[PDB]
Amino acid sequence: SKVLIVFGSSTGNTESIAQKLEELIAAGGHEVTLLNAADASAENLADGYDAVLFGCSAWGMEDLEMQDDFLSLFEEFDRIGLAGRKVAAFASGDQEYEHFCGAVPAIEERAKELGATIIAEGLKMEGDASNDPEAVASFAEDVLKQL
Ligand SMILES: Cc1cc2nc3c(=O)[nH]c(=O)nc-3n(C[C@H](O)[C@H](O)[C@H](O)COP(=O)(O)O)c2cc1C
């Protein structure tokens, strides 16, 4: 299958998770494309892809604010071509906050509104990929099986 992975990462934790995810799905016999949302042109970005995974950390002093490289892409979800495609979200976050990885539910809702199907429950964890390999491995499992 063809899998597209796009992320927005400020310190590198959501990046780390998106690279591990690329490795695990690619290992399953699938073609993975990895993009930093800061580099990606949204226009028809999903065309060709059987699933699309979105990674994005949560910030904001008060309410939830998305990582800014993702956000800019989030604005353009309308042109991506998500209708009838499979999608899932992941993120790095901090339990010590009220809205743990709040970007994840947010992505899932925008995606469903645009006609996407949610493949697996959003991955929510702390630190980089090495900090919770199980959580990463399992989320990749969930994804693989829906492909
Ligand atoms: C000011 C600020 C606000 C944050 N807010 C949240 C949040 O609300 N939810 C959450 O899970 N993590 C929150 N975090 C933790 C970061 O999301 C996480 O440590 C960081 O984004 C690592 O991901 P990244 O390196 O891929 O950017 C916050 C961090 C900073 C310092």
Which CATH number do you get for residue 24?
3.40.50.360
State the Cα torsion 69-17-24-123 to the nearest 10°.
-100
CA-to-CA distance for 68 and 9, rounded, in angstroms? 9
E strand intervals along 37-120:
51-56, 58-59, 65-66, 86-93, 117-118
For residue 16 and ligand 1, the question of a CB distance below 6 A is answered with: no
Q: 147: helix, coil or strand?
A: coil
For ligand 1, atom 12: residue with the closest CA? 93
CA distances, 21 to each of 28, 40, 98 (Å): 11, 18, 26
The structure tokens 């947010």 sit at 106
Instruction: Tell me the residue length of the chain.
Output: 147
Structural domain range at position 8: 1-147
Spacing, Cα 124 to ligand 1 middle (Å): 12
PDB experimental method:
X-ray
Quick one: resolution in A? 2.0
Q: Looking at the chain, list the stretches that DSSP marks H as alpha helix, in order from N- to C-terminal side.
A: 13-26, 68-74, 103-113, 133-145
Does 127 sit in the ligand 1 pocket, CB within 6 Å?
no
